Amino acid sequence: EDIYFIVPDYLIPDDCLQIHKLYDNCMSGNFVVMQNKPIQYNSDIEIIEHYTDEL
């Protein structure tokens, strides 16, 4: 469902949402989440601090 926080104003679906990943291939109503990185271990704002002092 649309339990999550919604940033647009009136364009909300107000209807059946779903995640379209594994319910089927290509069938369910669309609301797909996109990760930055599939498995997250360390943020790369730390690696950019890691080399920039050495640099």
Binding site: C16, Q18, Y23, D24, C26, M27, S28, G29
Partner: peptide, 24 residues
């Protein structure tokens, strides 16, 4: 062809509403 897609969309709509009140 077009129906094949809408028929697929409505079956998922039935399935994701049946599970909201299912015994499953």
């Amino acid at each position: 062809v077009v129906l094949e897609q809408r028929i697929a969309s409505l079956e998922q709509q039935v399935t994701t509403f049946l599970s909201s009140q299912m015994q499953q």
